[PDB]
């Protein structure tokens, strides 16, 4: 739906993009 | 000072395909084959006489466009795009262009008028 197909690889905990998102939403 | 682009170690920052930067040479057909103009003979002394001799079909009123040309050279230098520009319908300008190309090949417009 609103989520893309690369969502589970983008937001996987421990990955580079998920750590960047956690650093962005909490500096 | 600074080079364009954040990389500054590349000649092209967006890095296109190197076939995009390859040049394109060109050669006109006039360098290959010339275009000659035959003078008006005694059978067709004018350009309106040439349009009258090409007036054969009912749906190709060739002799109705005598005022659409300046002289013999203006008739024999106009291609089909310039005939479209001057306001000539498709069948009439096709007949005019084929008559001019037949006269350049050695065939004068000597055909029977099939109207009646």
């Amino acid at each position: 739906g609103g989520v893309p197909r690369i969502y589970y690889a983008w937001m996987r905990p421990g990955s580079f993009t998920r750590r960047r998102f956690e650093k962005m939403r909490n500096p | 000072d600074q080079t364009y682009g954040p990389h500054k170690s590349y000649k092209y920052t967006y890095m296109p395909d190197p076939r995009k930067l390859a040049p394109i040479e060109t050669t006109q057909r006039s360098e290959i084959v010339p275009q000659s103009i035959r003078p008006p003979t005694s059978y067709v002394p004018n350009h309106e006489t040439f349009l009258e001799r090409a007036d054969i079909h009912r749906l190709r009123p060739t002799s109705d466009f005598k005022a659409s040309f300046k002289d013999w050279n203006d008739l024999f230098t106009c291609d089909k795009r310039q005939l479209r520009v001057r306001g000539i319908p498709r069948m009439t300008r096709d007949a005019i262009r084929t008559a001019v190309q037949a006269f350049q090949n050695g065939n004068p417009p000597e055909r029977f008028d099939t109207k009646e």
Partner: protein, 229 residues
Amino acid sequence: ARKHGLFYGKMRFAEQKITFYSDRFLFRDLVNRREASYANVWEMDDPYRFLQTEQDYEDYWGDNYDVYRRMFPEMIGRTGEPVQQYGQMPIWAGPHRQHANKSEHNWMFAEIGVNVGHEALKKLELDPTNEKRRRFVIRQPDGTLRSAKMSEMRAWYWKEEWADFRFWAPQMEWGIENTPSQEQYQEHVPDTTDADFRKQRRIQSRPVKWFYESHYEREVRWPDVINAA
């Protein structure tokens, strides 16, 4: 080249292949190929020894390296193939039709058919030592009939977008295990009396100038001069 509003990925492998650990022979082939390969290749090594002029050096390494490396996947002793031109058939109308072959653009013509156009046989159909080579021709705008270049011949097949930066074929081992024997090639038993296709192609290759001076065993000698005799 990267576009603006989208994200890209990276290929882990270039091809979907079978692993070399699945068989002992593929493993031995990989170890023998890594023996015959470099670890790092630079501008002074033997695959880059064909750059004998500094103009070719600046042409290869400058502004066309992305095209020059995309020609052939394996590193060979050159970058393409030499271009040779063909003869024009005689036009019996004479100079009335000598203008018609010269045009504005280059006209490239490629072959198709039952024998020609297979992606699995691409390096064999572009082999210049193949007598059934896929025929290409290019008419220049001045009327010259020439053959196609290597990239021009590879443009008519499917894309091959990988490159080998290690293997160099003069570094192959040839003395201990890789010993091709003539008796192995004699096991096919190629004979001229049992099959005459090779002699027929040799007859098709040689000129037929002798057929007109047949009546002019009888063997052809030099012309005898009567003025000096």
